[PDB]
Amino acid sequence: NGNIQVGPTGQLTIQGHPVIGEGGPITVPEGSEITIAADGTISALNPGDP
Amino acid sequence: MSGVLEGSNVKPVEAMTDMIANARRFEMQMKVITSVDENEGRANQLLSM
Amino acid sequence: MISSLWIAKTGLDAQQTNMDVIANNLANVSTNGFKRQRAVFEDLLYQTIRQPGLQIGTGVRPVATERLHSQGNLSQTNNSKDVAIKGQGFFQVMLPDGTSAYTRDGSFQVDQNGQLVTAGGFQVQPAITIPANALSITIGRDGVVSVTQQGQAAPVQVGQLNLTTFMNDTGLESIGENLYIETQSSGAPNESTPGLNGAGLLYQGYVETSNVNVAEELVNMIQVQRAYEINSKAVSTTDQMLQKLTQL
Amino acid sequence: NGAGLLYQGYVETSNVNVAEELVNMIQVQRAYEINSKAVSTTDQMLQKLTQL
Amino acid sequence: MISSLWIAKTGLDAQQTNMDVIANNLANVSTNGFKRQRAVFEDLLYQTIRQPGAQSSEQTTLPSGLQIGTGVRPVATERLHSQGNLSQTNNSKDVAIKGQGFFQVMLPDGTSAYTRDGSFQVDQNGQLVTAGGFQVQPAITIPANALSITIGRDGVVSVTQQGQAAPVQVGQLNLTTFMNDTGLESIGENLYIETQSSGAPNESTPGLNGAGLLYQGYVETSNVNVAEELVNMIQVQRAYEINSKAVSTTDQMLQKLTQL
């Protein structure tokens, strides 16, 4: 199930289970347009900034 | 909210499943009753002689 | 019975209301001083299901239609009795029962004993009594109605056409025949002379046409028809699902 | 900060996709029927059991 | 109800607005001191979807993602403030501006507007007013028994009386110039009111600082070029037809979606 949701504090959870990356569970910069590449690279864009 | 009327909340799926389950339970109980009656009358013969 | 029939029924009713608004806008495309209506849809209550988080909707319901009070185009009538408004303002017209309504249709006539009345015959206040032997009626930009008589080389002042301004123009009650009455949402009718305190100016010989744009109405009709078809399909799908359920 | 801008005179429309929902309506109906067959099949299995 | 239909609606609205601009320019061909308008359009929103520049494959970026855009909106209409052709009418009261100045006029409500139409009249009291009855600033007053009125190229006004071989100056006609002439708000009646985007009114007599020179007996005709208007008709018609074709195609797609 690849339906990933972003928590209020930026934790990536699938069905309430915190997703685990190469360094453990992922902490996303609170509020960000997450883009996942073809191999799993996560890019975060913060609102307002360029 | 004004201008809207709320209807009943009866769910038909649960109702249909309940009716099916009730019929199948009633039939099983009838089978049990039949078995018990037949056993009693078989065993009522032990009082003779 | 819990079902999706009502949710799609509300959608059908909303599309019907939108189509009624569109048809009303299109039918009044020839009325002078008509403001187009737009219906605002905003959804119903939500039912919340608690986990050991999710909310299911109920449908859509019309809330309130807004009349667009933009200044419509002017059309030339070549009648000296017709005046159009440049800006925001309303003519005050006295109904027979006694309460004063407010209209923007500037097509006026003189009745059998003087007196300026609207097309429906209701008197325009203040009482502007035109003399019988009048040769030409001149209504100035600032609402001064002067009357020329044969012989006298100066026009005679008869009356002032005052404009009633509301702070909220959308909240007036549309009573029917091109008339609005003040309401609690459009209170404090402010009487002013035309040209001051935000009141509009008056053009004599012109009438203010309707505000209805045509392309919006036609494309909105297309959208209403297609959404109505979509909701009908949803109703049919719910009907088939219930039919399959009952046959068990 | 990260908020949006305002366009006066324009109203944001709904995000619903009609091609998305009509295709879903088709599968929901068919998934509803295939589940109803499980109820019918289970009832037939139970009906024969009580009859014995 | 569907995105393409909203985009086509915006396109139809833009082309319609272009048609209104063309019609307004055409209706005022005979208007003296009229300036033709041109509308400018801009792109509407662009839905982000796939972000262009986001890193795919750790070391390769994604160029030019899905920037799905919405329709079009008109930015603004700008007047072309150019010198119209001068027409000779042989009148003592018609004044034409040849440079970049405006006449100042007082509205009776107290404020002042600015007009370029130079067809002036005299009221019953002898004041120089506009054809709409608005009293031009300054309140140049003309004597009762005037034989000839001469408005010079420097804006000076002279009246020739009987028994006086020397004309007497009865006023001085000034021109108002602005930093930005497109920012004036047109209120009709050939009148512009000053806005905050048009700077502040700069008074100058005609011939210095840039104000133009005043010609007597001439009127500044409208600068509307009409063949350009006809060519713009042809486009404003095809573009509208093509946008309606897009509407029709979306309608057919939705109809087949509904019918199944």
Side-chain angles (χ1 to χ4, degrees), chain B residues 13 17 20 24 27-28 31, chain D residues 32 39 43 46-47 50 52:
Chain B
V13 182
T17 63
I20 300 200
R24 302 289 97 71
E27 287 155 58
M28 272 165 237
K31 170 65 180 344
Chain D
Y32 199 98
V39 165
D43 255 358
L46 281 176
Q47 154 184 300
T50 61
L52 81 81

PDB file of all heavy atoms in Angstrom, chain B residues 13 17 20 24 27-28 31, chain D residues 32 39 43 46-47 50 52:
ATOM      1  N   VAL B  13     -28.475  -3.924   4.204  1.00  0.00           N
ATOM      2  CA  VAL B  13     -27.557  -5.057   4.101  1.00  0.00           C
ATOM      3  C   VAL B  13     -27.584  -5.879   5.384  1.00  0.00           C
ATOM      4  O   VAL B  13     -27.713  -7.113   5.359  1.00  0.00           O
ATOM      5  CB  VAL B  13     -26.133  -4.564   3.783  1.00  0.00           C
ATOM      6  CG1 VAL B  13     -25.183  -5.738   3.629  1.00  0.00           C
ATOM      7  CG2 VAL B  13     -26.136  -3.699   2.533  1.00  0.00           C
ATOM      8  N   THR B  17     -28.921  -9.829   5.804  1.00  0.00           N
ATOM      9  CA  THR B  17     -28.083 -10.857   6.413  1.00  0.00           C
ATOM     10  C   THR B  17     -28.715 -11.399   7.688  1.00  0.00           C
ATOM     11  O   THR B  17     -28.657 -12.607   7.955  1.00  0.00           O
ATOM     12  CB  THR B  17     -26.683 -10.306   6.690  1.00  0.00           C
ATOM     13  OG1 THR B  17     -26.766  -9.229   7.631  1.00  0.00           O
ATOM     14  CG2 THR B  17     -26.035  -9.818   5.405  1.00  0.00           C
ATOM     15  N   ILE B  20     -31.528 -13.858   6.715  1.00  0.00           N
ATOM     16  CA  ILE B  20     -30.990 -15.137   6.252  1.00  0.00           C
ATOM     17  C   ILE B  20     -30.475 -15.960   7.429  1.00  0.00           C
ATOM     18  O   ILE B  20     -30.771 -17.159   7.557  1.00  0.00           O
ATOM     19  CB  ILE B  20     -29.892 -14.908   5.197  1.00  0.00           C
ATOM     20  CG1 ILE B  20     -30.457 -14.144   3.996  1.00  0.00           C
ATOM     21  CG2 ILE B  20     -29.283 -16.233   4.767  1.00  0.00           C
ATOM     22  CD1 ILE B  20     -29.640 -14.287   2.728  1.00  0.00           C
ATOM     23  N   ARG B  24     -31.867 -19.669   8.833  1.00  0.00           N
ATOM     24  CA  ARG B  24     -30.997 -20.833   8.947  1.00  0.00           C
ATOM     25  C   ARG B  24     -30.841 -21.320  10.381  1.00  0.00           C
ATOM     26  O   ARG B  24     -30.636 -22.522  10.585  1.00  0.00           O
ATOM     27  CB  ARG B  24     -29.628 -20.526   8.341  1.00  0.00           C
ATOM     28  CG  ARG B  24     -29.704 -20.106   6.887  1.00  0.00           C
ATOM     29  CD  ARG B  24     -30.062 -21.287   6.003  1.00  0.00           C
ATOM     30  NE  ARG B  24     -31.488 -21.324   5.698  1.00  0.00           N
ATOM     31  CZ  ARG B  24     -32.109 -20.478   4.889  1.00  0.00           C
ATOM     32  NH1 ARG B  24     -31.454 -19.522   4.250  1.00  0.00           N
ATOM     33  NH2 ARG B  24     -33.423 -20.593   4.715  1.00  0.00           N
ATOM     34  N   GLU B  27     -34.168 -23.277  11.303  1.00  0.00           N
ATOM     35  CA  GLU B  27     -34.212 -24.622  10.730  1.00  0.00           C
ATOM     36  C   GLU B  27     -33.341 -25.601  11.518  1.00  0.00           C
ATOM     37  O   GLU B  27     -33.739 -26.751  11.760  1.00  0.00           O
ATOM     38  CB  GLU B  27     -33.794 -24.569   9.262  1.00  0.00           C
ATOM     39  CG  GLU B  27     -34.858 -23.948   8.367  1.00  0.00           C
ATOM     40  CD  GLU B  27     -34.285 -23.350   7.101  1.00  0.00           C
ATOM     41  OE1 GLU B  27     -33.629 -24.086   6.337  1.00  0.00           O
ATOM     42  OE2 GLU B  27     -34.494 -22.140   6.870  1.00  0.00           O
ATOM     43  N   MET B  28     -32.154 -25.160  11.940  1.00  0.00           N
ATOM     44  CA  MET B  28     -31.287 -26.013  12.750  1.00  0.00           C
ATOM     45  C   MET B  28     -31.954 -26.379  14.067  1.00  0.00           C
ATOM     46  O   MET B  28     -31.866 -27.530  14.527  1.00  0.00           O
ATOM     47  CB  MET B  28     -29.962 -25.302  13.012  1.00  0.00           C
ATOM     48  CG  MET B  28     -28.900 -25.529  11.960  1.00  0.00           C
ATOM     49  SD  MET B  28     -27.575 -24.324  12.130  1.00  0.00           S
ATOM     50  CE  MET B  28     -27.587 -23.571  10.507  1.00  0.00           C
ATOM     51  N   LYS B  31     -34.383 -29.070  13.542  1.00  0.00           N
ATOM     52  CA  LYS B  31     -33.711 -30.364  13.435  1.00  0.00           C
ATOM     53  C   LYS B  31     -33.370 -30.930  14.812  1.00  0.00           C
ATOM     54  O   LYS B  31     -33.557 -32.128  15.069  1.00  0.00           O
ATOM     55  CB  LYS B  31     -32.452 -30.231  12.579  1.00  0.00           C
ATOM     56  CG  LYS B  31     -31.557 -31.457  12.602  1.00  0.00           C
ATOM     57  CD  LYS B  31     -32.255 -32.652  11.975  1.00  0.00           C
ATOM     58  CE  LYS B  31     -31.371 -33.882  12.003  1.00  0.00           C
ATOM     59  NZ  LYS B  31     -29.952 -33.530  12.279  1.00  0.00           N
TER      60      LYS B  31
ATOM     61  N   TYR D  32     -19.972  -4.848  -5.693  1.00  0.00           N
ATOM     62  CA  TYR D  32     -21.140  -5.091  -4.858  1.00  0.00           C
ATOM     63  C   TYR D  32     -21.849  -6.381  -5.249  1.00  0.00           C
ATOM     64  O   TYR D  32     -22.345  -7.103  -4.379  1.00  0.00           O
ATOM     65  CB  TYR D  32     -22.095  -3.903  -4.957  1.00  0.00           C
ATOM     66  CG  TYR D  32     -23.095  -3.798  -3.833  1.00  0.00           C
ATOM     67  CD1 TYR D  32     -22.865  -2.953  -2.758  1.00  0.00           C
ATOM     68  CD2 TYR D  32     -24.273  -4.533  -3.849  1.00  0.00           C
ATOM     69  CE1 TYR D  32     -23.770  -2.847  -1.730  1.00  0.00           C
ATOM     70  CE2 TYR D  32     -25.188  -4.430  -2.822  1.00  0.00           C
ATOM     71  CZ  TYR D  32     -24.931  -3.583  -1.764  1.00  0.00           C
ATOM     72  OH  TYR D  32     -25.831  -3.471  -0.733  1.00  0.00           O
ATOM     73  N   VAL D  39     -22.862 -14.099  -0.295  1.00  0.00           N
ATOM     74  CA  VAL D  39     -23.990 -14.282   0.613  1.00  0.00           C
ATOM     75  C   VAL D  39     -24.932 -15.356   0.083  1.00  0.00           C
ATOM     76  O   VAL D  39     -25.398 -16.219   0.836  1.00  0.00           O
ATOM     77  CB  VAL D  39     -24.721 -12.945   0.831  1.00  0.00           C
ATOM     78  CG1 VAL D  39     -26.084 -13.180   1.458  1.00  0.00           C
ATOM     79  CG2 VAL D  39     -23.888 -12.019   1.696  1.00  0.00           C
ATOM     80  N   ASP D  43     -25.554 -18.977   1.879  1.00  0.00           N
ATOM     81  CA  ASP D  43     -26.911 -19.367   2.245  1.00  0.00           C
ATOM     82  C   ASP D  43     -27.280 -20.727   1.670  1.00  0.00           C
ATOM     83  O   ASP D  43     -27.917 -21.535   2.354  1.00  0.00           O
ATOM     84  CB  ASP D  43     -27.907 -18.309   1.777  1.00  0.00           C
ATOM     85  CG  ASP D  43     -28.433 -17.459   2.915  1.00  0.00           C
ATOM     86  OD1 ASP D  43     -28.049 -17.717   4.074  1.00  0.00           O
ATOM     87  OD2 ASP D  43     -29.231 -16.536   2.651  1.00  0.00           O
ATOM     88  N   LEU D  46     -25.627 -23.365   3.761  1.00  0.00           N
ATOM     89  CA  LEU D  46     -26.349 -23.550   5.015  1.00  0.00           C
ATOM     90  C   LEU D  46     -27.728 -24.159   4.801  1.00  0.00           C
ATOM     91  O   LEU D  46     -28.201 -24.921   5.651  1.00  0.00           O
ATOM     92  CB  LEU D  46     -26.479 -22.217   5.749  1.00  0.00           C
ATOM     93  CG  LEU D  46     -25.256 -21.736   6.528  1.00  0.00           C
ATOM     94  CD1 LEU D  46     -25.510 -20.363   7.123  1.00  0.00           C
ATOM     95  CD2 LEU D  46     -24.889 -22.733   7.613  1.00  0.00           C
ATOM     96  N   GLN D  47     -28.387 -23.830   3.686  1.00  0.00           N
ATOM     97  CA  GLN D  47     -29.728 -24.349   3.434  1.00  0.00           C
ATOM     98  C   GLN D  47     -29.718 -25.865   3.295  1.00  0.00           C
ATOM     99  O   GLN D  47     -30.612 -26.547   3.811  1.00  0.00           O
ATOM    100  CB  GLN D  47     -30.311 -23.690   2.185  1.00  0.00           C
ATOM    101  CG  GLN D  47     -31.351 -24.522   1.458  1.00  0.00           C
ATOM    102  CD  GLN D  47     -31.829 -23.861   0.181  1.00  0.00           C
ATOM    103  OE1 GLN D  47     -32.375 -22.759   0.206  1.00  0.00           O
ATOM    104  NE2 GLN D  47     -31.623 -24.532  -0.947  1.00  0.00           N
ATOM    105  N   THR D  50     -29.219 -27.561   6.982  1.00  0.00           N
ATOM    106  CA  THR D  50     -30.380 -27.672   7.860  1.00  0.00           C
ATOM    107  C   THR D  50     -31.383 -28.690   7.331  1.00  0.00           C
ATOM    108  O   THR D  50     -32.121 -29.301   8.112  1.00  0.00           O
ATOM    109  CB  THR D  50     -31.050 -26.308   8.027  1.00  0.00           C
ATOM    110  OG1 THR D  50     -31.504 -25.837   6.752  1.00  0.00           O
ATOM    111  CG2 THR D  50     -30.069 -25.301   8.610  1.00  0.00           C
ATOM    112  N   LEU D  52     -30.789 -31.620   5.867  1.00  0.00           N
ATOM    113  CA  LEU D  52     -30.415 -33.005   6.141  1.00  0.00           C
ATOM    114  C   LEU D  52     -31.025 -33.476   7.458  1.00  0.00           C
ATOM    115  O   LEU D  52     -31.184 -32.693   8.394  1.00  0.00           O
ATOM    116  CB  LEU D  52     -28.884 -33.157   6.157  1.00  0.00           C
ATOM    117  CG  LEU D  52     -28.023 -32.794   7.376  1.00  0.00           C
ATOM    118  CD1 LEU D  52     -27.988 -33.887   8.444  1.00  0.00           C
ATOM    119  CD2 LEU D  52     -26.608 -32.436   6.937  1.00  0.00           C
TER     120      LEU D  52
END
